[PDB]
Amino acid sequence: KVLKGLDAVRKRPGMYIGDTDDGTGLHHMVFEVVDNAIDEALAGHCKEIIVTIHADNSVSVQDDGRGISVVNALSQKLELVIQREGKIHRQIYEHGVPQATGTMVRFWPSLETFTNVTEFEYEILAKRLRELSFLNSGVSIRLRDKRDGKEDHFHYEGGIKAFVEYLNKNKTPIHPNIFYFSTEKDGIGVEVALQWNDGFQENIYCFTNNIPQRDGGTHLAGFRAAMTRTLNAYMDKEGYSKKAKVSATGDDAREGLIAVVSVKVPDPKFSSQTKDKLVSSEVKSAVEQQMNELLAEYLLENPTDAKIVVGKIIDAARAREAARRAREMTRRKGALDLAGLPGKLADCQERDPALSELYLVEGDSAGGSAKQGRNRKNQAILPLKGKILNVEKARFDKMLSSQEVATLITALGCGIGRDEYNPDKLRYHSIIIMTDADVDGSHIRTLLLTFFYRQMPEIVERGHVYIAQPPLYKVKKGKQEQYIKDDEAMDQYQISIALDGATLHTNASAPALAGEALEKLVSEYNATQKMINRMERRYPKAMLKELIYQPTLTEADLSDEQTVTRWVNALVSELNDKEQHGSQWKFDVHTNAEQNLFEPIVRVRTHGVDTDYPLDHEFITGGEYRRICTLGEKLRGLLEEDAFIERGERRQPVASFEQALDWLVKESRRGLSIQRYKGLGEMNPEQLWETTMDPESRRMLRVTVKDAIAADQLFTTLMGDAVEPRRAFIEENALKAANI
DNA sequence: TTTTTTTTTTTTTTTTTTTTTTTTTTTTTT
DNA sequence: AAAAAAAAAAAAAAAAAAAAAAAAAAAAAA
């Protein structure tokens, strides 16, 4: 029982602990023990964790809590001495084989499993322990490197303030005070800290239950939104912006910012098993509210620092203003005066171009949805009418449509005629093509790009044209919510939910596989399945799927006639056993006298139609078979007889990776609910503001021309009158997609 | 100071138009 | 002869208007 699990862990140590070649497994074991010690300490029982690095390639972690397995299997020895109630009890585990106020565990890593990294780099351990000391306020950590004689004492009662001070010790902080708080509201404990510096670089560090988040997350978005809102409100109230004659925006307060954000959710939800991005919906609101209150309170309390921060922000805003191109003010449509603009236009209030935007939307319903949710000061909306003229196919004199005339009038380039064209009189220096997220939205985007590239080439060159990316799907699982752009992102999200909070055990008594390793296995499986589906015309799906689990057939096996017969006979017998349809599989071997190779053939009789699928020499080294062999080598022995999986409460014995994946997906899609938006008229205006109108949470794309000649050729082929180059291009791309 | 006709509800009855995309023909224009 | 331009077949994206039927307020003719 226990020995089976220990041997299972010992067979594939990289699956459980991580890649041992780079020494990451040893560091992972040390951090696991330190994490257990910190978990004991968080219950208010331990206060010192003396981590000693010995000279015999071993490390011991002391604990002072209440006190009294992957680590036992990989470790060749374990020294567990529990000092409880005035008693000392010693137990020694040797490869998980036992021989008979916390503990010191002096684990011995087995040199067989780990390769190329024996000794521990104490700088990495020191960095991680210092980070944990900052995160865990009032928790002493003692590093003791005995081999080199060095020692250290990481102990900071401030915590996040100490983290900010450590980050800013080498840099030049701009003001002495450090904003901080550790308020907790409805269980979402939030800790934030701030200190600007003269480096004009942004560095915001995010943590979630003492786990770093590389790619930000909901806490990062809430922090940024709260900071921008509070600083803008302070600027507007005190009137420093009017004296500066410039409006501060995002990426100016954030410029030259050092901050740390730490959260502790009871049930966190991440985008993947790497936990590099938090996607928990509830975390944003608490961070936003606490920042909105307390940062404003700090600004009121510290007017000396507020002046310096406002001065730096004004300097950044002045630099950004100076970087802009020369321009002039322009009349805007208003209640008193219309200035000869279209009725459908909903113009803004800011007369200055380069502080205004135009959203080109697909219709009147999307127009109303965007008009209800926007910023009236900056953003203007010009709703089109469905699909517009293809100016490439159409004549120049055919451009007398109300749709294109409305677009020409609002931009006021006067591009009609090719005589009054003047991009210097452009009314908006940010033209945004906010079409629907669906296929016809993409087509209308292409038509608008043709209009802008052909009729207004300098507007595209100067970078005024932008593309919005509104979401197509909204997915909800009770409290959780997300916005998804494409079906590929939908598939990735479905995989992430399937692997969310689930454990796979090779044996009945064995530990769970690592989340990263399981994600890599599932990614390999999905890639191979996609390749097999692409190969479905050439060969049957059943034979290709069965080739994964069979032994690999190398070129040396081809020369031996008996080996090929045994291999193909085993393959066909396995196919016949696992057959749920009327297909009848039979084997044959064809002998080439030229090359002395006995190639196999797998005859099939499906639906009464007999067919032969010879696996020639090309297929053995055809590239796809290499991928099949690699996945087979990965998946030979990841499922014993008593394998099972779990998703927390529920359990399921399994016998194949297909069964486990299907069960995981089926449990993923239990509470799921997808809302597909068939254009912006189906989104609420608040949803439009959150996703793709707010500059804080915007995701745009500048249209640029890398090559003029290649762009012209592509436009003429895809959008010209001649159909044959278009058909050839589409067929070539279809074949390219079908092939690797 | 007085008629008269015009706007607005909210349920009813009615219709109308503009583009994309590919073959194939028919005009018409040189 | 030759090129260019318009129309129509079928699925897609967009939208536009005319009147009844009461009350009650403007905003001009008289």
Side-chain angles (χ1 to χ4, degrees), chain A residues 72-314:
Chain A
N72 296 24
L74 287 86
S75 56
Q76 68 192 356
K77 287 200 166 183
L78 283 178
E79 302 188 354
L80 196 186
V81 170
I82 170 55
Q83 303 176 4
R84 197 211 184 188
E85 63 172 4
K87 300 177 176 61
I88 310 97
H89 320 268
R90 173 154 170 166
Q91 305 182 12
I92 301 301
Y93 290 79
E94 179 170 9
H95 301 257
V97 186
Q99 298 178 2
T101 62
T103 87
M104 46 182 293
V105 174
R106 180 182 296 183
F107 78 102
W108 296 83
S110 61
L111 306 178
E112 298 181 356
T113 58
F114 304 95
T115 56
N116 307 331
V117 174
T118 54
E119 295 183 1
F120 318 95
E121 297 181 6
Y122 80 106
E123 52 263 32
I124 293 160
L125 305 177
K127 183 172 183 297
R128 178 54 177 171
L129 292 160
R130 202 196 287 90
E131 287 180 0
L132 294 159
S133 67
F134 294 140
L135 295 157
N136 300 276
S137 60
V139 174
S140 299
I141 290 162
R142 268 281 185 178
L143 178 59
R144 299 186 178 177
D145 185 17
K146 287 192 175 185
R147 50 160 181 166
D148 294 322
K150 298 176 184 179
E151 290 187 357
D152 202 329
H153 181 231
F154 311 113
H155 181 49
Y156 313 93
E157 300 186 0
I160 315 312
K161 291 191 289 186
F163 212 142
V164 170
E165 287 174 350
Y166 173 73
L167 290 170
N168 279 313
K169 73 193 192 301
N170 67 278
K171 301 187 178 179
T172 56
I174 199 179
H175 74 283
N177 304 339
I178 291 160
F179 176 66
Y180 79 109
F181 61 95
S182 62
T183 309
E184 185 172 7
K185 190 179 181 65
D186 303 338
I188 307 103
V190 170
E191 301 179 356
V192 190
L194 305 172
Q195 187 170 16
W196 284 264
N197 52 359
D198 308 333
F200 50 90
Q201 293 290 116
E202 189 184 6
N203 291 272
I204 295 156
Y205 302 96
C206 302
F207 294 90
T208 306
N209 302 284
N210 310 273
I211 297 159
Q213 316 303 303
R214 301 188 295 91
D215 309 338
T218 56
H219 40 34
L220 189 282
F223 166 79
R224 287 187 174 185
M227 165 159 285
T228 50
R229 182 170 176 180
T230 49
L231 282 165
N232 291 328
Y234 186 81
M235 292 273 193
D236 203 336
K237 171 52 178 66
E238 304 298 338
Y240 293 110
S241 57
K242 292 187 176 182
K243 301 294 186 179
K245 308 182 184 180
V246 71
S247 300
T249 67
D251 305 327
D252 292 355
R254 278 176 266 166
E255 189 172 321
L257 177 59
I258 301 300
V260 174
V261 186
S262 180
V263 195
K264 294 190 175 181
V265 195
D267 300 321
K269 299 290 182 64
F270 302 90
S271 67
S272 58
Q273 268 51 32
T274 62
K275 301 190 175 188
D276 299 328
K277 187 172 182 180
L278 188 68
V279 302
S280 188
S281 61
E282 304 94 329
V283 172
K284 188 176 172 180
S285 62
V287 174
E288 277 191 345
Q289 289 182 5
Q290 291 184 14
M291 281 285 290
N292 281 7
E293 295 179 352
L294 298 171
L295 177 51
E297 210 290 327
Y298 164 79
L299 288 171
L300 292 170
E301 204 282 338
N302 290 262
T304 60
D305 307 323
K307 286 181 175 181
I308 293 157
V309 169
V310 167
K312 169 158 274 289
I313 292 161
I314 288 159

Side-chain angles (χ1 to χ4, degrees), chain A residues 13 18 112 149 169 206 212 219 254 265 301 330 399 443 460 517 545 627 652 696 698:
Chain A
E112 298 181 356
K169 73 193 192 301
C206 302
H219 40 34
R254 278 176 266 166
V265 195
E301 204 282 338
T330 59
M399 295 201 307
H443 186 213
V460 175
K545 286 178 179 182
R627 292 193 180 185
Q652 185 66 14
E696 273 66 8
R698 233 191 282 177

